[PDB]
Enzyme design. Structure first.
Site, PDB file in Angstrom:
ATOM      1  N   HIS A   1       0.868  -1.224   0.000  1.00 19.16           N
ATOM      2  CA  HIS A   1       0.000   0.000   0.000  1.00 19.16           C
ATOM      3  C   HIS A   1       0.904   1.274   0.000  1.00 19.16           C
ATOM      4  CE1 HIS A   1      -3.323  -2.870   0.499  1.00 19.16           C
ATOM      5  NE2 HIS A   1      -2.815  -3.294   1.665  1.00 19.16           N
TER       6      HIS A   1
ATOM      7  N   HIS B   1       4.432   6.888   7.276  1.00 16.04           N
ATOM      8  CA  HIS B   1       4.343   6.539   5.855  1.00 16.04           C
ATOM      9  C   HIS B   1       3.833   7.771   5.106  1.00 16.04           C
ATOM     10  CE1 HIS B   1       0.414   5.925   7.600  1.00 16.04           C
ATOM     11  NE2 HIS B   1      -0.018   6.437   6.410  1.00 16.04           N
TER      12      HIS B   1
ATOM     13  N   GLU C   1      -4.158  13.196   0.854  1.00 16.01           N
ATOM     14  CA  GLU C   1      -5.471  12.663   1.308  1.00 16.01           C
ATOM     15  C   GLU C   1      -6.334  13.796   1.796  1.00 16.01           C
ATOM     16  OE1 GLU C   1      -4.616   9.105   3.795  1.00 16.01           O
ATOM     17  OE2 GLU C   1      -5.190   8.139   1.865  1.00 16.01           O
TER      18      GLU C   1
ATOM     19  N   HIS D   1       2.125  10.850   7.113  1.00 13.89           N
ATOM     20  CA  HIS D   1       1.356  10.463   8.315  1.00 13.89           C
ATOM     21  C   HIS D   1       2.301   9.829   9.342  1.00 13.89           C
ATOM     22  CE1 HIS D   1      -2.557  10.152   5.808  1.00 13.89           C
ATOM     23  NE2 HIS D   1      -2.232  11.468   6.142  1.00 13.89           N
TER      24      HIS D   1
ATOM     25  N   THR E   1      -7.358   6.012   7.230  1.00 15.42           N
ATOM     26  CA  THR E   1      -7.721   6.242   5.810  1.00 15.42           C
ATOM     27  C   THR E   1      -7.547   4.998   4.974  1.00 15.42           C
ATOM     28  OG1 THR E   1      -5.592   7.009   5.058  1.00 15.42           O
ATOM     29  CG2 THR E   1      -7.105   8.682   6.020  1.00 15.42           C
TER      30      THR E   1
HETATM   31  C1  LIG Z   1      -4.079  -3.805  15.180  1.00 20.29           C
HETATM   32  C2  LIG Z   1      -4.953  -3.558  13.997  1.00 20.29           C
HETATM   33  C3  LIG Z   1      -4.882  -2.431  13.025  1.00 20.29           C
HETATM   34  N1  LIG Z   1      -4.178  -2.876  11.815  1.00 20.29           N
HETATM   35  C4  LIG Z   1      -4.807  -4.049  11.191  1.00 20.29           C
HETATM   36  C5  LIG Z   1      -4.103  -4.146   9.823  1.00 20.29           C
HETATM   37  C6  LIG Z   1      -3.749  -2.674   9.507  1.00 20.29           C
HETATM   38  C7  LIG Z   1      -4.195  -1.875  10.737  1.00 20.29           C
HETATM   39  C8  LIG Z   1      -3.189  -0.833  11.078  1.00 20.29           C
HETATM   40  N2  LIG Z   1      -3.185   0.267  10.131  1.00 20.29           N
HETATM   41  C9  LIG Z   1      -2.146   1.089  10.121  1.00 20.29           C
HETATM   42  O1  LIG Z   1      -1.205   1.105  10.937  1.00 20.29           O
HETATM   43  C10 LIG Z   1      -2.099   1.920   8.919  1.00 20.29           C
HETATM   44  C11 LIG Z   1      -2.753   3.132   8.895  1.00 20.29           C
HETATM   45  C12 LIG Z   1      -2.648   3.966   7.784  1.00 20.29           C
HETATM   46  S1  LIG Z   1      -3.366   5.585   7.904  1.00 20.29           S
HETATM   47  N3  LIG Z   1      -3.318   6.297   6.494  1.00 20.29           N
HETATM   48  O2  LIG Z   1      -2.517   6.296   8.840  1.00 20.29           O
HETATM   49  O3  LIG Z   1      -4.765   5.382   8.274  1.00 20.29           O
HETATM   50  C13 LIG Z   1      -1.931   3.561   6.673  1.00 20.29           C
HETATM   51  C14 LIG Z   1      -1.256   2.313   6.721  1.00 20.29           C
HETATM   52  O4  LIG Z   1      -0.492   1.790   5.733  1.00 20.29           O
HETATM   53  C15 LIG Z   1      -0.267   2.591   4.576  1.00 20.29           C
HETATM   54  C16 LIG Z   1      -1.364   1.501   7.846  1.00 20.29           C
HETATM   55  O5  LIG Z   1      -0.919   0.176   7.817  1.00 20.29           O
HETATM   56  C17 LIG Z   1       0.188  -0.125   8.653  1.00 20.29           C
HETATM   57 ZN   LIG Z   2      -1.767   7.372   5.931  1.00 23.31          ZN
END
Ligand SMILES: C=CCN1CCC[C@@H]1CNC(=O)c1cc(S(N)(=O)=O)cc(OC)c1OC
Ligand SMILES: [Zn+2]
Length: 258
Positions: A62, A92, A104, A117, A196
């Site tokens: 991603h 990221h 975003e 972020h 997001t």
């Molecule tokens: C303990 C459960 C939560 N986990 C479950 C799988 C991803 C989710 C965590 N999501 C994030 O940390 C996560 C969050 C965002 S964002 N734009 O900050 O919402 C983006 C991301 O990967 C581009 C992320 O993946 C690592």
């Molecule tokens: Zn993000």
């Protein structure tokens, strides 16, 4: 048929696996600068990154995530709209195929070339997985990127991307100082929102800095050489990994500045 950013699996499809995609506090949003209200009750943000311990950089299919040691209070975010202490777990970016899109959040409908972020979790919930189940579990510091002069503090990130081209690749990424990614001013907007990306959990206090950082055309071009695909698979360049603005619904965006 997993979620992503293509025609067949992109943001307009996410609601089928993740019905919260149509919820009351989704992110990102457009920041209408004329309707955001100065809140003199907010505080100065406290960004304390001097003891940060970066560990690793991962292409997760991603984006790429720069991951930190969050097993103690080292790199923490406090103050502003927050109550308590939030530990940095990863940063990221989101970016576009061309300089006119990638962010975003938007500002008066303006899209920036990219958005950083810095994701932090509220220590009162003990671990990240517990925090994302709480309405005040996460604080995400969002920073816009525009294309112009190089950002010296970004080059170490740029130079390791060749080594994590494809999904599931990681590299050692010790001693990286995230203070080199911050703008001069910590003036910000804040609102309650969500992750997001799926699972789009409504657990985030968003803090979006007003002042963008400048990166060079060469720096962002290296972001666009990454791949969404795994090694050996048909090449799909990692571009346009952004969710568009979502309805503000019953929310107020507050400004830290007059
Ligand atoms: C303990 C459960 C939560 N986990 C479950 C799988 C991803 C989710 C965590 N999501 C994030 O940390 C996560 C969050 C965002 S964002 N734009 O900050 O919402 C983006 C991301 O990967 C581009 C992320 O993946 C690592
Ligand atoms: Zn993000």
């Amino acid at each position: 048929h997993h979620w992503g950013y293509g025609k067949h699996n992109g943001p307009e499809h996410w609601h089928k696996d993740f019905p919260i995609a149509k919820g009351e506090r989704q992110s990102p949003v457009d920041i209408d600068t004329h309707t955001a209200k100065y809140d003199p009750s907010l505080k100065p943000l406290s960004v304390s990154y001097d003891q940060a311990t970066s560990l690793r950089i991962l292409n997760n299919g991603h984006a790429f995530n720069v991951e930190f040691d969050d097993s103690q209070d080292k790199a923490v975010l406090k103050g502003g709209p927050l109550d308590g202490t939030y530990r940095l777990i990863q940063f990221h970016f989101h970016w576009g195929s061309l300089d006119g899109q990638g962010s975003e959040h938007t500002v008066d409908k303006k899209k920036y070339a990219a958005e950083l972020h810095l994701v932090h979790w509220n220590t009162k919930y003990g671990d990240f997985g517990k925090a994302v189940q709480q309405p005040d579990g996460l604080a995400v510091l969002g920073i816009f990127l525009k294309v112009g002069s190089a950002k010296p503090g970004l080059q170490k990130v740029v130079d390791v991307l060749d080594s994590i081209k494809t999904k599931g690749k990681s590299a050692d990424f010790t001693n990286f100082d995230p203070r080199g990614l911050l703008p001069e001013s910590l003036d910000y907007w804040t609102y309650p929102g969500s992750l997001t990306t799926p699972p789009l959990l409504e657990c985030v206090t968003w803090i979006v800095l007003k002042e963008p950082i400048s990166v060079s055309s060469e720096q962002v071009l290296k972001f666009r050489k990454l791949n969404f695909n795994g090694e050996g698979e048909p090449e799909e360049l990692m571009v346009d990994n952004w969710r568009p603005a979502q309805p503000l619904k019953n929310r107020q965006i507050k400004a830290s500045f007059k």
